[PDB]
Amino acid sequence: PLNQQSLGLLIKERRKSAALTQDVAAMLCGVTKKTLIRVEKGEDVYISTVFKILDGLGIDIVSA
Amino acid sequence: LETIMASPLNQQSLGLLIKERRKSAALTQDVAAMLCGVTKKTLIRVEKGEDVYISTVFKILDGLGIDIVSA
């Protein structure tokens, strides 16, 4: 089960697996690089931002 | 709810998931909010799919025993 930190790590791993820099990923997800960095580090942001990033990187989350 | 869980979550269906889980546990919004350590207003916002900080959502998911995972 995900928490705020492991969600960030998931996003980071998915981004790296897709061979995307933070700049390109940020551009693709429609957020600033700073914001993506915040999210990957597990720092607090609005849920909408997280969904923008999950959507942009093609990461699906579901109920266990 | 069986449609929600059968798909990847978005901001709205997450709220609906929370709502249905709360209802299945026979909890009012007041009691659930108390259990999750948030105000009723905040829980209502989350159930309606309105924007809040992710930490709040995790507080609510934890309090209601809802686990989310990567698909």
Q: How many domains does chain B have?
A: 1
Residues paired with B45 in a beta bridge: none
PDB experimental method: X-ray
From chain A, pick out residues whose CB is under 8 angstroms from the CB of B15.
Answer: none
Burial of A7 (0-12, 13-18, 19+ CB in 10 A): buried
Helix (H) or strand (E) holding B70: strand B68-70
Closest CA to B20 of B71, B70, B65, B69: B65
Q: Furthest-apart CA pair in chain B: how many Å?
A: 32
Residue of B nearest to A11 (CA): B70
Q: Are A55 and A48 in contact (CB under 8 A)?
A: no
Query: Cα A37 from chain centroid?
Result: 8
**Domain enclosing residue A33, as ranges:** 1-64
Q: DSSP string spanning chain B? A: -TTTTTS---HHHHHHHHHHHHHHTT--HHHHHHHHTS-HHHHHHHHTT---BHHHHHHHHHHTT--EEE-
**For the CA atoms of B65, A60, A30, B38, what is the dihedral angle to 10 degrees?**
-10
Q: Which two tokens stand for residue A59?
A: 């990461």
CATH number of the domain that residue B53 is part of: 1.10.260.40
Burial of B26 (0-12, 13-18, 19+ CB in 10 A): exposed
Q: Which two tokens stand for residue B39?
A: 């105000």
Alpha-carbon distance B66 to A62, whole Å?
A: 10
For A2, the closest of B4, B7, B69 (CB atoms) is: B69
Query: Cα B28 from chain centroid?
Result: 13
